[PDB]
């Protein structure tokens, strides 16, 4: 079968805190 991944699979790429930044 098949399904659509709408907006899934997003993970924090590094162990660095960040805030109000569009990295």
State the residues that interact with another protein by CB under 8 A: 3-13, 15-23
Least distance (Å) between residue 5 CB and another protein? 5
Q: Is 7 exposed, middle or buried (0-12, 13-18, 19+ CB in 10 A)?
A: exposed
Please give the backbone phi and psi of residue 11, each rounded to the nearest 5 degrees, phi first: -140, 155
Q: How far is the CB of 13 from another protein (least distance, A)?
A: 8
Minimal distance in Å, beta carbon 2 to another protein? Answer: 10
């Amino acid at each position: 079968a098949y399904t659509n991944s709408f907006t899934r699979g997003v993970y924090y790429p590094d162990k660095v805190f960040r805030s109000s930044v569009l990295h």
